[PDB]
Amino acid sequence: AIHRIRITLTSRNVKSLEKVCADLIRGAKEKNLKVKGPVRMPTKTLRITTRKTPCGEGSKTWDRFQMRIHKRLIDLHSPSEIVKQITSISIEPGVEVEVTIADA
Amino acid sequence: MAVQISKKRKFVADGIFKAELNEFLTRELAEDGYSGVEVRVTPTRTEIIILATRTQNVLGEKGRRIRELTAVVQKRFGFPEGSVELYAEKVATRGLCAIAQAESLRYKLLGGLA
Amino acid sequence: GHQQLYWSHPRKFGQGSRSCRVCSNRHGLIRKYGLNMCRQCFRQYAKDIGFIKLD
Amino acid sequence: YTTPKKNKHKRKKVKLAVLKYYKVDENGKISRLRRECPSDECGAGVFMASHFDRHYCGKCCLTYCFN
Amino acid sequence: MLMPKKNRIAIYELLFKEGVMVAKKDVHMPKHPELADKNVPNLHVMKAMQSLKSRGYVKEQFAWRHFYWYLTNEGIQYLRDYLHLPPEIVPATLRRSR
RNA sequence: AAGGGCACCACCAGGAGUGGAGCCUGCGGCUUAAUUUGACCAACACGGGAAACCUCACCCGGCCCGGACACGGACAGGAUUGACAGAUUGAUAGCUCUUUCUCGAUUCCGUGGGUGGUGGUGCAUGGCCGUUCUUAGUUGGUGGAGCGAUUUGUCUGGUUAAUUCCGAUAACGAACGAGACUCUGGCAUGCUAACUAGUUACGCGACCCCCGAGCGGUCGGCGUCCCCCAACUUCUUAGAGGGACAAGUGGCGUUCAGCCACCCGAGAUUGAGCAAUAACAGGUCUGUGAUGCCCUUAGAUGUCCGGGGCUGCACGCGCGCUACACUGACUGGCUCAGCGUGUGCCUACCCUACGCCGGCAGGCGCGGGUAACCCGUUGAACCCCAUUCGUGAUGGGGAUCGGGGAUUGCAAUUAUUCCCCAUGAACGAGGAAUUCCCAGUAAGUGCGGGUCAUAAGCUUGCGUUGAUUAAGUCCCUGCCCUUUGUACACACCGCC
Ligand SMILES: [Mg+2]
């Protein structure tokens, strides 16, 4: 086994996360695990504002940089065991995955 | 948990690692037709692919230089042993890489062409 | 001098304890998100980290 | 410039000759005429200094005072 | 450099065990990270590798705040006859599994 | 000089102001051992520059080589390195001296040669950035004209925010810029989905009415992803899509390009990012192991340590904060946010709930959070509702200054900051001048981030309350196109 696991995906782009959150749950449906829906956490917007010039002379122009971090949560729940069933990750570069159990 | 840092610091550190590795590879493989670096990280292990033009040149005598750089990137960032692998990849359409063309132009000017 | 005074002055805090992780500068550091990079070096490398301009 | 103090004289060592600060007598009878540093880090090999009012161990940096 | 044999040979055998060595540029670092048990300051290894660079047995690369010294073929036999080791033991980068 | 057009870094009509006072801060000047220095629309809260030490580059002193490598001397009968005591020193720097021990080939001396430098030169340079200029402008190929520099293309006109387009046409065909583009805001009771977001319903409770209601009212009280033991996605989140095109109607218009008005609509102009050719002796060599050349390199312009300085004041200026009060101050009560951060490679330094003590600043235990899980339903301020005050330099204002208590740190003096009790100064709306601005805008008002061991009168963002005036013009200051004049071309700050 009685296992209930959580898989979290996080990256900087939405295309890769969307296709992973698509193909993973599709593999789960074809491999008949009932799937808790993909939950989209609020986006983390890392903002860094910095003077453009390396000198301090100029017209006080500020360059603002953003990093967007997006993360999704998918809970895999089967009456049978899960880890011995699903082993493949199928993860492209640019996205980080973390798999925990309901205990942690 | 307490051992791992937050996601914000983690992504920033990953970007810093990419930038540091890119700077090192640029300063090291300058004459070897360096183009770029692509890192694929997994919890099991990580793979570093060096896009360049002269793969046979970046690889030393029987991979001596690629072994050297693998050990360097091993020690400088302190991965677990055997958890990083360095592959050298030949680029396609080297005329389309601005890095390779700029490096070749710099080499020509250093050689002494007008 | 010997080991007793060469580096004896405390630098456990303050502006003298921090330097840019790239250019070893002590001015205009960015410590947000543990970046620890100089103001100019962050502009230099910000494309590589992933800090990109949107607005 | 015009530094008020003169150029400080850096130390030059005394340029010591052969040590020979121990003697044996009547066809060999050992006489340690120097103090022995008893610590483990000094060991039983090195001798101590023979200053006019104390003894100094070169390695152990122990100073034994006799009053 | 006034650094003694007891850590000169330590640095040299570290450099010969694997074909490279990485050293952060910090003359005030109390201890070099690897060879943790030898009580060697970072300054000693930095100047030793600088001397090896000067004599030509190692080639030097400098990223942001790090040195990436690469041992050379002229370094092979100089380390070998410094350490009095037969030319059968090689650095790890030279020969692997062969 | 003319014609056409345009812009709140221009004006008009106005708003809030600044210039007046106190203070903070940045420049000049003065003084000083030093008050390090760059910069003079497009310098002066700018160098992310809020400096006790560090920073630091300046001043007064004191250490170390962290002078590779080559050569020659030197040496295990010792090249040479450290060090206790006394003086000496600011120093417990064996720095130096008296004094002897101790390391052992790593060094030491000399000659070349390094190396380092927040030293000089931004008028030798790269990169970046500012500006010209965010205006609509810019360029080839082939063809035409001209001996040629050049010109046409790139235009009379209409239109546009736009050389934007319709059209004319010795030009044709293109290219960049504009636009298109990306992010953002406003609409989706339509789709997907949620125990790190909820709503509704139900069931346990707690309290009021219980006269009698009772499917009565409140609950940010507890439960129903605890796995069988409710559903659903409106509200929150974030993806995929749609949605707006001058599309529909009327009028103007060459009835073209377009313009005005209205309906329906969430929306009929949401703000940003990027941003051409050519250039400036514009700024940075004090961001860089970007860098040429010069200077210095052992009594150092390298580096470290101690102290001081960067704050220093007859004075002038700039960016700001606080006010001059009753559209208010004080006291109490009630009631509302959104950005966004949070424990670290070196690197020590996190955000904090709750409980106890103290009057406050704070202190002490117990946790939570590497985070839509905890701070936190971020109980913010202004505002609102009541109290006192009463037109006075007053309960306005809080400068200056005395005494005392904590916190950070190795260290608080020239007061780091915070707290308490005392003093209550100028200031009664500010000359000549001058800045910014058109709708959720100005302004009032607080809250985050950066800087941060300690800290914001700064800056970058966020929300809350929320307007007056205007839908125009070339009058001033400027910009674009055409014609024109020129004795200018370093280009009217010209020339003479
Ligand atoms: Mg009062």
Touch test B–E: 3 Cβ pairs or more under 8 Å: yes
Phi, psi of E21 (to 5 degrees): -155, 145
CA dist A66 → C46, C50, E38 (Å): 10, 8, 45
Indicate which of A9, A13, A46 best probes the interface with B, i.e. most B CBs within 10 Å of its own CB.
A46
Q: Where are the alpha helices (DSSP H) in A7-97?
A: 14-30
Task: Classify residue B86 as exposed, middle or buried by CB count within 10 Å of its CB (0-12, 13-18, 19+).
Answer: buried
Q: Is A80 exposed, middle or buried (0-12, 13-18, 19+ CB in 10 A)?
A: exposed
d(CA B21, CA B73): 8
Cα–Cα distances in angstroms (integers) from residue B20 to residues B83, E42, E59, in the given order: 19, 21, 20
User: Is E1-98 assigned to CATH 1.10.510.10?
Assistant: no
CATH of the domain at B67: 3.30.300.20
Q: Is the CB of D7 under 7 A from strand F?
A: yes
Q: Give the residue numbers in B contacting E (CB under 8 Å), as ranges.
A: 20, 23-24, 27-28, 64, 67-69, 71-72, 75-76
Q: Please report the sign of the dihedral spanned by the C-alpha atoms of residue B93, residue B95, residue B98, residue B104.
A: positive
Domain of residue C49: give its range: 1-55
How far, in Å, CA of E94 to CA of B63, rounded? 9
Any strand F atom closer than 7 Å to D60 CB: no
Residue of chain C nearest E27, judged by CA positions:
C7
| Closest Cα in chain C, distance from residue B60 (Å) | 28
Q: Is C41 annotated in some ligand binding site?
A: yes
Distance CA E24, CA B77 (A): 11
Decide if E94 and B75 are in contact by the 8 Å CB cutoff.
no
Tokens 């890119």 — which residue? B22
In chain A, where the domains are located: 1-104
Helix (H) or strand (E) holding E77: helix E73-83
Which residues on B lie below 8 Å from E62 (Cβ)? 27
In chain E, domain spans: 1-98
Q: According to the entry, how was the structure determined?
A: cryo-EM
Residue A36 approaches strand F within 7 Å at CB: yes
* Experimental structure resolution, Å: 2.7
Specify if B76 maps to a domain. yes
Judge whether B50 and B29 are in contact, CB under 8 Å: yes
Q: Do C48 and B22 touch (CB under 8 A)?
A: yes
Classify residue B15: in a domain, yes or no: yes
Domain count for chain C, please give it: 1
For residue C42, the chain A residues in CB contact (below 8 A) are 48, 50, 65
User: Contact E93/B64, CB-based, under 8 Å?
Assistant: yes
Tokens of A62: 């500020």
Contact C45, C39 (CB under 8 A): no
Question: What CATH number did the domain enclosing C17 receive?
Answer: 4.10.830.10
